[PDB]
Design a protein around this ligand. Structure first.
Ligand SMILES: C1CCCC(Nc2nnc(C3CC3)o2)CC1
Length: 149
């Protein structure tokens, strides 16, 4: 799969993260991110995708070594960590045909797994609107603990 790049934007308290809501297949909440173009450097793709989806330019704030990266179904997704962004920032997608809404969420309130359906003796996982974000939540919490504590 083609690698994706984006950002985990946190506010000044380190409590809240910025998620964006797409449409259809991307109908839930996730971190801003998208597919790398040919010959495009990871930091440039992250900044482009974030600016397209949020209207906020991270370019002056990217730290090269500060990211969480996951390989899901043999696609690589790397989110640069960008703390300290004020909660009163005006975010506006470029692209309202792609982005429904943009909100801050409390990190401690976000799920770090979906729930099973053990109550119903059925296999699988219950739907959760944070499905696209969830894989990153525990690594994010651990990364923040190590870096700040
Ligand atoms: C809406 C705007 C665009 C970013 C999008 N990010 C995303 N994270 N996982 C996926 C699935 C394709 C694998 O997409 C979700 C939020």
């Amino acid at each position: 799969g083609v690698p994706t790049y984006g950002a985990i934007i946190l506010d000044e308290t380190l409590e809240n993260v910025l998620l964006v809501q797409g449409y259809l297949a991307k109908s839930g909440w996730g971190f801003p991110k998208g597919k790398v173009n040919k010959e495009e450097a990871p930091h440039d793709c992250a900044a482009r995708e974030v600016f397209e989806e949020t209207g906020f330019d991270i370019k002056d704030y990217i730290c090269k070594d500060d990211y969480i990266e996951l390989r899901i179904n043999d696609q690589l997704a790397r989110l640069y960590i960008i703390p300290g962004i004020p909660k009163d920032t005006k975010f506006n997608p470029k692209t309202r045909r792609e982005i429904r809404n943009i909100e801050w969420f409390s990190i401690e309130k976000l799920p770090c797994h979906r729930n099973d359906m053990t109550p119903k003796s059925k296999l699988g996982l219950a739907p959760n609107k944070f499905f696209m974000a969830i894989p990153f939540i525990r690594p994010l919490r651990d990364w923040l603990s190590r870096r700040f504590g």
